[PDB]
Amino acid sequence: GDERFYAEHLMPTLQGLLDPESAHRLAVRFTSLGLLPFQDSDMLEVRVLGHKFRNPVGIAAGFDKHGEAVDGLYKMGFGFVEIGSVTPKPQEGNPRPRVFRLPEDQAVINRYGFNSHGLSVVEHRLRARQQKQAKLTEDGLPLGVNLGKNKTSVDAAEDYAEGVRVLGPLADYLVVNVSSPNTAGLRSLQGKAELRRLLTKVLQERDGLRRVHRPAVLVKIAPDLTSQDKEDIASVVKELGIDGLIVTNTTVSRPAGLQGALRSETGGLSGKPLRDLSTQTIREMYALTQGRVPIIGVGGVSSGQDALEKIRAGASLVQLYTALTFWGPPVVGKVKRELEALLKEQGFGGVTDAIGADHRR
Ligand SMILES: Cc1cc2nc3c(=O)[nH]c(=O)nc-3n(C[C@H](O)[C@H](O)[C@H](O)COP(=O)(O)O)c2cc1C
Numbered sequence: 001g002d003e004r005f006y007a008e009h010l011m012p013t014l015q016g017l018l019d020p021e022s023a024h025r026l027a028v029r030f031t032s033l034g035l036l037p038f039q040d041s042d043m044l045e046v047r048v049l050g051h052k053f054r055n056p057v058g059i060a061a062g063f064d065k066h067g068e069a070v071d072g073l074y075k076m077g078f079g080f081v082e083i084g085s086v087t088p089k090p091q092e093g094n095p096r097p098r099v100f101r102l103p104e105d106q107a108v109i110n111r112y113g114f115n116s117h118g119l120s121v122v123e124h125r126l127r128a129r130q131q132k133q134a135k136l137t138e139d140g141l142p143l144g145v146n147l148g149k150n151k152t153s154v155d156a157a158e159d160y161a162e163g164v165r166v167l168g169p170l171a172d173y174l175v176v177n178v179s180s181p182n183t184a185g186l187r188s189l190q191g192k193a194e195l196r197r198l199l200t201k202v203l204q205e206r207d208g209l210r211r212v213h214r215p216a217v218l219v220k221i222a223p224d225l226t227s228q229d230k231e232d233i234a235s236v237v238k239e240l241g242i243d244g245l246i247v248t249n250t251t252v253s254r255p256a257g258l259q260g261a262l263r264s265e266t267g268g269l270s271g272k273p274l275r276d277l278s279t280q281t282i283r284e285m286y287a288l289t290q291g292r293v294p295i296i297g298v299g300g301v302s303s304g305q306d307a308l309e310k311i312r313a314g315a316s317l318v319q320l321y322t323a324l325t326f327w328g329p330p331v332v333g334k335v336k337r338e339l340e341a342l343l344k345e346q347g348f349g350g351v352t353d354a355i356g357a358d359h360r361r
């Protein structure tokens with residue numbers, strides 16, 4: 001239950017015994033069973049997206065792709081859980097190996113390619129705990145569902161629409177993930193006319209759900225967008241009343257300075273080398289949306305400082321994944337404790353007061 005023991009001994013031993021996909025699969029298993037090693041202060045509570053969040057630190061999509069470990073993840077101390085990406089039909093994703101740790105860079109590269117049990121399997125998994133989730137949500141522990149598309153699908157919009165219909169009624173928020181680096185053509189849905197048409201369809205579908213089963217809809221974007229792309233996304237988001245943005249997915253870039261032997265593997269890069277590219281993207285999106293569109297900031301968060309930098313830049317909430325793969329579950333408590341201490345040090349009454357604070361100086 002100790003940050004040092006996990007960081008110095010448990011995790012490096014795990015890395016020497018198992019390949020990363022296997023270590024991840026085992027992680028999901030242990031978590032699902034609640035076999036895990038902090039008290040949330042009122043300071044960490046945030047109200048956004050039509051919900052209370054008892055703390056602003058969520059688990060990013062990709063860790064629990066199939067909704068198998070939701071309860072274990074709340075136990076781990078996350079203020080909110082996002083599952084997925086989930087695709088309409090089951091699909092296997094890319095051949096293995098398809099995930100790689102770069103320990104010298106505190107980074108991961110992955111090219112899973114949306115391996116997914118599919119909508120029906122995840123629907124029944126969530127239904128089995130639907131009321132337990134209703135209580136968790138009411139208690140300040142919301143659930144997000146991240147929607148993907150099948151590799152061979154002709155009609156991307158219809159895949160997302162199917163996801164809204166099937167998992168929308170079970171989610172506090174949905175994510176239209178148009179930013180995986182590992183599905184051909186996917187990120188091009190980030191363009192203006194394509195995006196407007198896609199999102200109009202998604203929102204129509206969401207609006208057609210009964211009120212108690214009607215989730216917020218967020219769009220998750222890449223860190224690799226052009227200025228024009230970001231400008232266009234901000235315009236469409238405001239035009240359509242999209243509920244929020246998730247900023248960012250992994251990067252296809254390979255920043256100068258990566259040391260890991262595996263740095264030239266194909267896929268999206270996450271962890272520390274992504275951190276500041278993500279923060280700057282949050283900063284840009286917040287400004288372009290006039291601070292009126294909630295942002296979930298993600299990419300390279302491994303400490304309270306990392307979290308607060310994203311919050312100050314415009315994020316109402318943050319998520320992490322890659323940090324867990326190096327530091328294990330104690331990183332969650334660490335981030336929260338550090339964030340609380342920094343908020344006090346910087347004169348903020350709570351997280352809410354810090355949201356977008358850089359933009360006001
Ligand atoms: C192994 C792996 C798988 C991921 N799978 C997904 C995915 O299914 N859908 C998605 O929206 N993001 C996925 N992500 C991206 C994360 O949600 C997150 O945006 C990114 O890794 C940056 O955060 P981090 O640096 O804390 O890991 C994945 C990331 C990794 C490391």
Ligand SMILES: C/C(O)=C(\C#N)C(=O)Nc1ccc(-c2ccccc2Cl)c(Cl)c1
Pocket residue numbers: 010014019020021023024026027028030031035036037099101324325326328329
């Ligand atoms: C490459 C890799 O280790 C991962 C990925 N992706 C990963 O998730 N690792 C990992 C391994 C064990 C754990 C873990 C889970 C439950 C209890 C204790 C631990 Cl160390 C976690 Cl939270 C993450």
Ligand SMILES: O=C(O)c1cc(=O)[nH]c(=O)[nH]1
Pocket residue numbers: 062085110111112113114115177179180181182249250268
């Ligand atoms: O390969 C995936 O499944 C995947 C990886 C990633 O980094 N981001 C994403 O949205 N999907």
